[PDB]
Design a protein around this ligand. Structure first.
Ligand code: ZN
Length: 7
């Protein structure tokens, strides 16, 4: 799957 990190 895909992964996104929004700090
Ligand atoms: Zn993955």
């Amino acid at each position: 799957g895909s992964n996104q990190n929004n700090f």
